[PDB]
Amino acid sequence: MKLAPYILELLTSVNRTNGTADLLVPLLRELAKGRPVSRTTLAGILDWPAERVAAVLEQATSTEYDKDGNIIGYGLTLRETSYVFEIDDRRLYAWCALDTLIFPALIGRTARVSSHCAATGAPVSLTVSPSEIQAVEPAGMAVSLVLPQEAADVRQSFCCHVHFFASVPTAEDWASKHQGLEGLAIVSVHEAFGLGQEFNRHLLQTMS
């Protein structure tokens, strides 16, 4: 289908005043190492005043911290979710299905991704590289999308509704019971990977 509305609202969410657009890729690359990331450390990597890092993270209310106050999650996370994101035999996690498709190009690594169908519990897996997906098991795997909402935190408004499904027909049956979700749509995992590619192209454009 036509995924411009999803691309547009995802970009608007990161490009928002005090949004994550310029901090996102450096933070994901740091989290990809598998250790908590200090705010002070992040400021140095970005060459920002601490003030600027804080205002961004403050707006990003979904950011996850550990007992020491270090960052352990923003899209990519060290805290267990339904979306397993394995890089170089380090098991990390992601906040949603589309995140798993987006991150490999941004961190320059291939990931072994696994989850379960949100409609049936069936195991699903695939290998996601910066340029392509492979080993899609099962081959008809699908993804749900919703429209991000103005000014809303991306995790409760978008991520928690963006799942893998075993197939498009299974996903459409599920979607028929959830039409209250804004802009709910079912796409193949390939279409979703394409959406991620478009998001990334625009993100990497704008990056200073």
Token couple for 5: 């509305």
Place of tokens 């890092």: 53
Closest CA to 122 of 184, 168, 167: 167
Residue 51: other Cβ atoms inside 10 A = 9
Count how many Cα atoms sit within 13 Å of the Cα of residue 12 in the half-sphere of its side chain.
12
Experimental method: X-ray
Classify residue 37 by its DSSP letter: B
DSSP H or E segment with residue 106: helix 97-107
Options 47, 88, 99, 173, the catalytic residue: 99
In 3D space, the residue among 55, 65, 41, 197 whose CA is nearest the CA of residue 131 turns out to be: 197
Given 22, 47, 159, 173, the catalytic residue: 159
159 is catalytic: yes
Q: Which of 96, 117, 153, 173 is catalytic?
A: 96
Q: Is residue 160 annotated as part of the catalytic site, yes or no? A: no
Residue showing tokens 């601490």: 50
Domains of the chain: 1-208 (3.30.450.410)
Residue that has been written with the tokens 């690594």 in this structure: 109
Cα–Cα distances in angstroms (integers) from residue 144 to residues 11, 47, 121, 208, in the given order: 18, 37, 15, 32
Q: Encoding tokens for residue 67?
A: 């007992």
H-helix or E-strand spanning residue 156: helix 154-157
Does residue 66 carry a catalytic annotation? no
Antiparallel, parallel or unpaired: β 142-145 and 71-74:
unpaired
Which residues contact residue 56 at a Cβ distance below 8 angstroms, ignoring those fewer than 6 apart?
Answer: 18, 19, 20, 23
